[PDB]
């Protein structure tokens, strides 16, 4: 993966990260 390296990603996506 590597989304949870962006903060915004990560924020939105709590699930995913």
């Known amino acids: 993966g ?3 390296s962006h903060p ?5 996506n709590q ?3």
């Open 8 to 12: 915004a990603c990560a924020a939105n």
């Open 15 to 17: 699930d995913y990260c």
């Open 2 to 4: 590597g989304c949870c």
